[PDB]
Design a protein around this ligand. Sequence first.
Ligand code: HEM
Ligand code: HEM
Ligand SMILES: O=C(CCCNc1ccncc1)N[C@@H](Cc1ccccc1)C(=O)O
Ligand SMILES: O=C(CCCNc1ccncc1)N[C@@H](Cc1ccccc1)C(=O)O
Ligand code: PHE
Ligand code: PHE
Lengths: 451, 450
Amino acid sequence: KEMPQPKTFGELKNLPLLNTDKPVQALMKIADELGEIFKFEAPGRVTRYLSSQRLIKEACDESRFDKNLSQALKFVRDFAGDGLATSWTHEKNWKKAHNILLPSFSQQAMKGYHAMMVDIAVQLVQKWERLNADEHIEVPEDMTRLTLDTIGLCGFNYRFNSFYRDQPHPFITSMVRALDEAMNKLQRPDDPAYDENKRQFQEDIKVMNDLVDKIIADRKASGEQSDDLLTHMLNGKDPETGEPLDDENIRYQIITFLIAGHEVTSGLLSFALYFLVKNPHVLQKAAEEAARVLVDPVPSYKQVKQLKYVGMVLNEALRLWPTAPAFSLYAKEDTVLGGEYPLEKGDELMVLIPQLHRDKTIWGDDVEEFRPERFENPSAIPQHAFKPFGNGQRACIGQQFALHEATLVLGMMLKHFDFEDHTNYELDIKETLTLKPEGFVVKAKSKKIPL
Amino acid sequence: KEMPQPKTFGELKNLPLLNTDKPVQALMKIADELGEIFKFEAPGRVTRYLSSQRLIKEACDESRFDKNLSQALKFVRDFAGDGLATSWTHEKNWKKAHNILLPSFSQQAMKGYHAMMVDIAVQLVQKWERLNADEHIEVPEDMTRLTLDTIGLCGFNYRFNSFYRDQPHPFITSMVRALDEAMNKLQRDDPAYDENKRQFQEDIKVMNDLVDKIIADRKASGEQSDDLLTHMLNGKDPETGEPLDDENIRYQIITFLIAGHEVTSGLLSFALYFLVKNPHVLQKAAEEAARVLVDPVPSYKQVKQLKYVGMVLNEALRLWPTAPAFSLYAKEDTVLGGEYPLEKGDELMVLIPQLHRDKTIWGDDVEEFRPERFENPSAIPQHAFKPFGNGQRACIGQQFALHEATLVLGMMLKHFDFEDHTNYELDIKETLTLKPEGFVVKAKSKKIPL
Ligand code: HEM
Ligand code: HEM
Ligand SMILES: O=C(CCCNc1ccncc1)N[C@@H](Cc1ccccc1)C(=O)O
Ligand SMILES: O=C(CCCNc1ccncc1)N[C@@H](Cc1ccccc1)C(=O)O
Ligand SMILES: *N[C@@H](Cc1ccccc1)C(=O)O
Ligand SMILES: *N[C@@H](Cc1ccccc1)C(=O)O
């Protein structure tokens, strides 16, 4: 009945607990001490962090709870606008864009993106083939180069050409810095010293809008059709309203795809490769499948679907380190959570996904072990025990994109190289809007298989 | 490219090879001679028996192969109906019952069945505690009493009371006799089988009448239990929104008893056989049982901690998987192993005991009983170990079977020392399943109270 709460800081309540560079990991440690639910207070803010499948399955009841914009999402909305991820469910543009974009993200739609995904994946493999002996790979850096370029190409047929660069494309520099500012504001008491941050934030917003608005304008003037999301958004109409997306919302969707999609996906690939080199038996089983299935120089769409064990590796990586580590909900009406926590209408909840995925009552005692065999039969996973892509109608629209992209790339990586954990890398998880293993490096010895 | 085939008998092709009391062991011997794949033909039938992990890992690709009803399953369907085990994947009632029943067979659902499993397990232990000196245990007989009573209690809150009986409950007599007729039909319709046909229909009626009565009795009473019948009367398929009808519920209950009891009792009997044949392994398992089972009654959490007992059971399943085969058909034209082209509809049989003896997977000591092989599931190649079938058509009862077997074997190892007093020679009887016929032991109580 009485809800636990972590240590407080006088008038600041729990807010200084987030004044740390690893807030998700701090919140996981708090959940370890306090259990399946704890209250978190800040000035003008009250929320409750959920960690058990028992309570989270109730929070995922869409008749009782709807998606809430966390403070992180509210600050990201300053440049993601009313794109899909930072829209409220009741805003006209959410359901409108949802209806228009859902067919463009289906499993069937991945067939049309596959060639562009292979384009960037080949660039990654060729980069690694061209490294000299005893040179090493900066894993999250290269994975981010790949995910950003892949979403740029599939999103609006634009090449950031990240594998030709040390310094990222100016758009990416502003995007990353806009994301940093949004997350930094959370742990912030906005005195005059943050005036430089505010000025830079508006400059980065303009850089992103200008490039995306220019590409939309360029595409409309040309009239060209590609296999990208931009073409689908220029031509698609919402069956409900009968309306197409306007040019401003299309810009916010493109910005959203880059922001919401690139970092979670590169983090997944980096964590998956980390767990593979830390678990050689798993790596051998995954590499066997990649060699058996990927019999052609370029993987086909159908071949990627056959990489079953690679998909199990990826899901187990998402279980331990879900790269989008939380989502937020609010009570649609007064309701009682778990039969003992009464909530009033509007009360907020946070789903702490890494803790959910460590619920021993669901996964057993070996929760911290990396065992892709947990996912050998998907039906053995209880409802709402595994939520790396969120919940319900507000779940990740990019889920099939992310998993096709990650399965393809990890498959090709395992087909073409043996990997050495040459530094015995100590896992260090950097936190931004997402999670990723900072400083993860490996050596790749080519199997000398041509492309 | 050219597929081997065992000796033929003119117009009967390979069919007389199955006119034997141990057809699985005969098929294993054929695989020893012919290798990883051989064609098997009978009048109006062609199939291919697979024995290597190399080919079986491809056969387990659900995008290329779906479950086929073998001739055995087709004959079992005459009384199991469109229950889960004898339905095609494309039948509406398969996916419907699958969606409804899957939560009631989960690892989490075992917590609710645990008390009823303990009920029957205690009856088994008490029977053995009450034996006189120099009396012995008939192991497969007692294990079958246990598993049948456990599924009756957890399935529909019915007590067959097998430990109070010499002659089985009438339902069991008809069920066993219907299974025997189904398997006998394989190796076989002249006028002489008219008695078999008449008896077969009588046993079907006995099974339907009792199960239909229990369903009707439950609906009339309205009482709720922690059994599968209650879940089926109240559950609705999330996809269609429909509940199972009373006829299908009857087929599911019949299926649980037919598909679950004999495989599970065979596993326990084989596991105890291997334990008494391997005293060092027995001691390690008994050491774990004493360390873990510190209470008079095992808890659910304690059974989950019987790690080595679980490895013992898995190794018993490796050597003698009590459901010895499953059947598949090619969804489209496809090439198996890069050298065996198959047409759409072509049939495959997975010979599980041979798969589990693939030296390229397990090493040269394939015939040795070493539970330590299963210490790390990630070290086992894909599809090397298939005692519970494959994919969405895998055994829905896997968690039920392993929980019951771990609980019961744990209690057996806690409470008794076992003597292989006859130096028993393994003799595997074949029905629909496999079990060690005539396996007997003596149990000396450790005098630990319940
Ligand atoms: C491993 C990769 C990914 C993970 C773990 C992930 C995770 C998530 C999560 C947890 C949510 C729900 C957020 C909330 O409820 O507040 C979400 C929503 C969303 N994601 Fe992803 N995501 C991934 C990849 C992608 C990709 C590749 C794209 C697009 C190219 C994408 C686009 C979106 C969008 C648009 C939404 C909002 C959908 C809506 O509310 O209508 N994501 N994602
Ligand atoms: C050691 C014990 C057991 C073993 C080795 C075993 C083995 C198997 C195998 C190999 C299959 C797949 C058959 C095929 O593909 O044709 C299967 C399916 C099935 N088993 Fe078991 N089983 C065991 C225990 C149980 C129990 C205790 C139950 C129920 C109480 C059960 C119910 C079922 C059902 C319903 C199916 C069909 C599932 C479906 O197709 O949807 N089994 N079993
Ligand atoms: O809730 C969040 C934001 C989670 C990121 N969500 C997302 C990513 C990608 N795509 C869609 C959605 N974070 C937690 C943890 C946190 C982070 C930073 C500071 C404090 C706390 C939160 O509690 O807000
Ligand atoms: O394929 C079979 C039947 C396998 C039993 N399947 C099963 C058991 C329990 N639960 C679900 C499913 N048998 C083999 C071997 C055989 C037996 C009898 C006669 C001939 C051959 C087969 O090839 O048919
Ligand atoms: N991810 C949470 C973190 C937070 C909680 C409470 C106050 C401020 C920030 C969010 O973005 O809301
Ligand atoms: N288990 C097999 C046995 C069989 C093979 C070939 C012809 C008839 C029977 C089956 O049940 O189909």
